[PDB]
């Protein structure tokens, strides 16, 4: 009964969008991760 929070950095591209690059197994996330808590 525990949740996980991965490496959620800020890798915002030239779109002005905050893109997250997850160091899970090395993952990318466009918006706020499902595990962003």
């Amino acid at each position: 009964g525990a949740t996980a929070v991965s490496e959620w950095t800020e890798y915002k591209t030239a779109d002005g969008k905050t893109y997250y690059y997850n160091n899970r197994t090395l993952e990318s996330t466009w918006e706020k991760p499902q595990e962003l808590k």
């Binding site: 890798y11 915002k12 591209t13 893109y19 690059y21 990318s28 996330t29 466009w30």
Partner: peptide, 9 residues
């Protein structure tokens, strides 16, 4: 120098 971003999927 600063790192380049990967493009997101």
């Amino acid at each position: 120098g600063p790192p380049l971003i990967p493009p997101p999927p």
